[PDB]
Scaffold this active site. Structure first.
Site, PDB file in Angstrom:
ATOM      1  CB  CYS A 189      49.751 114.249  60.212  1.00  0.00           C
ATOM      2  SG  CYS A 189      49.607 114.561  61.917  1.00  0.00           S
ATOM      3  CB  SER A 190      51.137 118.569  59.024  1.00  0.00           C
ATOM      4  OG  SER A 190      49.772 118.840  59.492  1.00  0.00           O
ATOM      5  CB  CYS A 191      51.323 117.841  64.848  1.00  0.00           C
ATOM      6  SG  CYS A 191      50.266 116.470  64.415  1.00  0.00           S
ATOM      7  CB  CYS A 233      54.007 116.387  62.694  1.00  0.00           C
ATOM      8  SG  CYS A 233      52.602 115.261  62.936  1.00  0.00           S
TER       9      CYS A 233
HETATM   10 FE   LIG Z   1      50.717 116.419  62.214  1.00  0.00          FE
END
Ligand SMILES: [Fe+3]
Ligand SMILES: [Cl-]
Ligand SMILES: [Cl-]
Ligand SMILES: [Cl-]
Ligand SMILES: [Cl-]
Ligand SMILES: [Mg+2]
Ligand SMILES: [Mg+2]
EC number: 4.2.1.84
Lengths: 212, 192
Positions: free
Chosen positions: B99-101, B96
């Site tokens: 972000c961090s998905c 991601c």
């Molecule tokens: Fe994310």
């Protein structure tokens, strides 16, 4: 938003801090680390005070130097706190009083967001599409590396979701759109300066147009 | 200037909790979910099933959501699933960049390294080098395909089944499908 969070393709970073299958330790490395996500869920699911998209955006709205020096879970403490203040649920005074010191928040939004576009195209697997050459100052789920670039549809989702550019500002006009897995050749995105094959970006319909 | 992060985080909790906005047991519930339920052991189960059941493999690759739902593993940040198949000419890897998905229910919450600026910046552009640095040499005769988790699709890699595992039980196969294999940065390893 062309923020510092749009990191893909930035050069100058060092080694990723991991070797494969190394022990990553416990899920949470400090006793507070479950709070940001838990309280995000209280906000979204229990209170209805904001969307997940608004959480993504409020983190994007951290002052850029602040973003860059803040660990991951702390960003979300700052983001969720910011949204509770902006939505009138909490005050910054009470957060600093309880914290015993400074609790700087994300910056205000510089954009009101935009609606889901009324004019879009339903694409099919195998079709060539270009990512719309648009600049959006508020929230958008398009990393800049693909802006204006051409790829091919690998998948059209069988569900639809609100347009992030709207719902990430709490707007009432997010509609619903499917997304598309768009496959780009590595050279389309980074020229000769890449070692990869292809990159697949999951892009909302409203970010796409037919290729020339 | 900032107060200690622990103090800020508990201040946020206390502010909301003291207004009656946080149900009894609420954060503690979520902590338990995050620590005990969301887990790459679930993704490993899915992979071992696909490896041993051609019909399920087909389902997982065509309608990942449906396949996952059969095991009851749909959940927050994991409601629309696509599984992506490694082949003798293709290695898939998930990030991601924004972000961090991550497919939380089946991969677990993302590790620190996956959320790092280093991984988020670099793997989209130089995945071969990043994997190499991490300990995974992808033969020069294999395409790398990076999936950037930019919307609601949540991905898992279906790695190739390694030689030397023929006839293993689902439990045996589960053991060698690690979190890093599901993200796509590692290839399942067979002991000797
Ligand atoms: Fe994310
Ligand atoms: Cl703590
Ligand atoms: Cl269009
Ligand atoms: Cl880590
Ligand atoms: Cl693991
Ligand atoms: Mg730049
Ligand atoms: Mg076999």
């Amino acid at each position: 938003m062309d923020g510092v969070h749009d990191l893909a393709g930035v050069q100058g970073f060092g080694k990723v801090p991991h070797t494969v299958n190394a022990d990553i330790g416990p899920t949470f490395h400090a006793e507070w680390e479950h709070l940001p996500y838990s309280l995000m869920f209280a906000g979204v699911a229990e209170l209805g005070a904001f969307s997940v998209d608004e959480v993504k955006y409020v983190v994007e709205r951290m002052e850029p130097r602040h973003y860059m020096m803040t660990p991951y879970y702390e960003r979300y403490v700052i983001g969720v706190a910011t949204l509770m203040v902006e939505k009138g649920i909490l005050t910054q005074d009470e957060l600093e009083s309880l914290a015993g010191g400074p609790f700087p928040l994300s910056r205000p939004s510089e954009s009101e967001g935009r609606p889901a576009p009324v004019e879009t195209t339903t694409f099919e697997v195998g079709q060539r599409v270009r990512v719309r050459d648009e600049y959006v100052p508020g929230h958008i789920r398009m990393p800049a590396y693909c802006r204006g670039r051409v790829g091919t549809i690998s998948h059209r989702t069988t569900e639809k979701w609100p347009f992030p550019d709207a719902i990430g500002h709490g707007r009432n006009d997010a509609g619903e759109e499917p997304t598309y897995h768009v496959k780009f050749a590595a050279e389309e995105l980074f020229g000769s300066d890449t070692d990869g094959g292809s990159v697949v970006v999951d892009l909302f319909e409203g970010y796409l147009e037919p290729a020339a | 200037a900032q107060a200690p992060v622990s103090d800020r985080a508990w201040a946020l909790f206390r502010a909301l909790d003291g207004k009656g906005l946080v149900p009894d047991g609420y954060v503690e519930g979520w902590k338990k979910t995050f620590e005990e339920d969301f887990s790459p052991r679930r993704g490993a189960e899915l992979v071992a099933r696909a490896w041993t059941d051609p019909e399920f493999r087909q389902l997982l690759l065509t309608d990942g959501t449906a396949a996952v739902a059969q095991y009851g593993y749909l959940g927050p940040q994991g409601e629309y699933i696509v599984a992506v198949e490694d082949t003798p000419t293709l290695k898939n890897v998930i990030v991601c960049s924004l972000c961090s998905c991550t497919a939380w229910p089946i991969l677990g919450l993302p590790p620190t390294w996956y959320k790092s600026f280093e991984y988020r910046a670099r793997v989209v552009r130089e995945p071969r080098k990043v994997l190499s640095e991490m300990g995974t040499e992808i033969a020069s005769d294999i395409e790398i395909r990076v999936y950037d988790t930019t919307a609601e699709t949540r991905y898992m890699v279906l790695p190739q089944r390694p030689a030397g595992t023929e006839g293993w039980s689902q439990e045996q196969l589960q053991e060698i499908v690690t979190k890093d294999c599901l993200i796509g940065v590692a290839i399942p390893q067979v002991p000797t």
